[PDB]
Each structure stands twice: as structure tokens, then as C-alpha cells.
Design a protein around this ligand. Structure first.
Ligand SMILES: CC(C)[C@@H](NC(=O)CC1CC1)C(=O)N1CC[C@](O)(c2ccc(Cl)cc2)C(C)(C)C1
Length: 268
């Protein structure tokens, strides 16, 4: 029950995703790695909930594993930040490419293009990471790189983690993920947005397309209210995003970690 324009819209987003999402992270290389060897307490709390171990599988069959240090409250807590800055940068590049390949996005004035990207980049990054998230093992499988959460459901108290588990449980199709990305990208309320009426109508069309796609393709009782669950999830993500900007701004105060691209995207 999808209109030709709805069908064309999904196709354009699926095409843009295919071209700009390297699911195997093959071109993510030359990144930094942790060394072989007060307002800080706020940074300690914000970081400790987000601890991950890092595994790197080599082409030859070798495996490098990194287990992070204890919080001791010092320096040790930023060991993985240069690596994460490099991952964020690589992902942000893919997100920018994604937006630049979409007709509806290219057509907006350059000022609004920049304003939508600075506002949604983090959200689109997190949505892409959810597709590589293994909820059974608590790990993001990024090709040769694996990021494993270091109890029980006390990690679901961290909004970022609750978001990933709750979104993974919805068992979304590639189309629903790409539609979520479009709804987040075309948010008319991002600071510096001039074409607020155009961006708003565009977003409404992506939301209608998603609502209609679900109605036509997911008839089972488990998918009842799925459109509304997804929409509440995007509201939660906007809230996680505002919180994350604040946490990143605090880390940047104690020690500059942000790459030129992250500085550009976070307004630094
Ligand atoms: C979801 C969360 C646990 C985490 N994912 C990971 O560890 C595994 C990656 C593959 C998905 C993540 O995506 N973030 C978001 C970015 C982050 O806030 C941050 C990055 C760089 C700098 Cl300089 C400062 C802060 C972070 C603290 C790393 C937590």
C-alpha cells in the first residue's frame, strides 16, 4: 500500500545507506590505540558507565585484546578517548556522505545542510552502531574491531546503553533504520535552521512513509504501535544527544580530545 513517491523515497535512502555505510569498517585504519605502558568526579561518573574492552582481529588470524584500567581517580579514564575520537570521525564522515547523496538534502541551502548535520550527526552515528550491536553479548561488531561492554541490568541505567538494547529489541528492518536516520536528519528545530517549513514538511513525509511501510509490511501483533515506539525512541535519542554534547564539552574542558571534524560538528 505504498505510493510510487513513498517507494522512490525508501529506494533513495537505501541507496544512500548502501553507498556510505561500510558495514565491515574496512576503511577505518591508522587510528590511535591506548598506550602499551574537582569537576573530574562528574567526568568519572559519565565515563565509567560507558566502559568497553577492545578486540582487534588481524587478517593473519592474530587477535589483540585491550582490557581498560580501573578508575583510580585519575588520568587512566581517558586511555580510549583518542581511539574513540578516531572512530567518531570515521563514522561522522560516513554520515556526511549519506546526507550529501540524498536529493532532499542536497536541495536545501548550504547553511541548512551544515545546521542539520551538526544537529543530527551523533544521532545518525548511534543509529548506524545499533545495526552492528549484538545485544546477547553486549558488543558492537565493527568488522575486525569489537567493543564489548565491561551488575546485570544496572548498565541499562545508562541512557545510551538502554537505547541500544531497546532499539535492538524492536528487530527493525534496514528500511526502518534508514527512515529513522532521515527523520533525525530532517529535524526542523535544530539551531541555525532557516528553511524550518521545508525541513518540517520533508520530515513529516519520511514519518508518513515509515508509518505506511510498517502498516503494509508488519501485520503481526508484536508490531502493534511499532511506529509510535520508533518515534518515542527518536525523542529519547534527541535527549541522549543533548546530554552527550554536555558530557563531551566537559571532557574537552579538562583535556582536548575532539578531532577537527568533531570540533566542526560540536561548534568548537
Ligand atoms: C555507546 C557507547 C558505549 C560508546 N560506544 C563504544 O564505546 C563502542 C562504539 C562502536 C560503538 C559511544 O558511542 N560513545 C559516544 C562517544 C563518546 O562520548 C566520546 C567519544 C570521543 C570522545 Cl573524545 C569523547 C566522548 C564515548 C565515551 C566513547 C561513548
Amino acid at each position: 500500500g505504498l505510493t510510487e513517491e513513498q517507494r522512490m523515497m525508501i529506494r533513495e535512502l537505501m541507496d544512500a545507506q548502501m553507498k556510505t555505510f561500510d558495514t565491515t569498517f574496512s576503511h577505518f585504519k591508522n587510528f590511535r590505540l591506548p598506550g602499551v605502558l574537582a569537576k573530574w568526579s562528574q567526568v568519572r561518573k559519565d565515563l565509567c558507565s560507558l566502559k568497553v574492552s577492545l578486540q582487534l582481529r588481524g587478517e593473519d588470524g592474530s587477535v589483540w585484546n585491550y582490557k581498560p584500567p580501573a578508575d583510580s581517580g585519575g588520568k587512566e579514564i581517558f586511555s580510549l578517548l583518542p581511539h574513540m575520537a578516531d572512530m567518531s570521525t570515521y563514522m561522522f564522515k560516513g554520515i556526511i556522505s549519506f546526507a550529501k547523496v540524498i536529493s532532499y538534502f542536497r536541495d536545501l541551502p548550504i547553511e541548512d545542510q551544515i545546521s542539520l548535520l551538526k544537529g543530527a550527526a551523533f544521532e545518525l552515528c548511534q543509529l548506524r552502531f545499533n545495526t552492528v550491536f549484538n545485544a546477547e553479548t553486549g558488543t558492537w561488531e565493527c568488522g575486525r574491531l569489537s567493543y564489548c561492554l565491561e551488575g546485570f541490568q544496572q548498565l541499562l541505567l545508562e541512557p545510551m546503553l538502554k537505547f541500544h538494547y531497546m532499539l535492538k529489541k524492536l528487530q527493525l528492518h534496514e528500511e526502518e533504520y534508514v527512515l529513522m536516520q532521515a527523520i533525525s536528519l530532517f529535524s526542523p528545530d535544530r539551531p541555525g535552521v532557516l528553511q524550518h517549513r521545508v525541513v518540517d514538511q520533508l520530515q513529516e513525509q519520511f514519518a508518513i512513509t515509515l508509518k505506511s511501510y510498517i502498516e503494509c509490511n508488519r501485520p503481526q501483533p508484536a508490531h502493534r504501535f511499532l511506529f509510535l515506539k520508533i518515534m518515542a525512541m527518536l525523542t529519547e535519542l534527541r535527549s541522549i544527544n543533548a546530554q552527550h554534547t554536555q558530557r563531551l564539552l566537559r571532557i574537552q574542558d579538562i583535556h582536548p580530545f575532539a578531532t577537527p571534524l568533531m570540533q566542526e560538528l560540536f561548534g568548537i
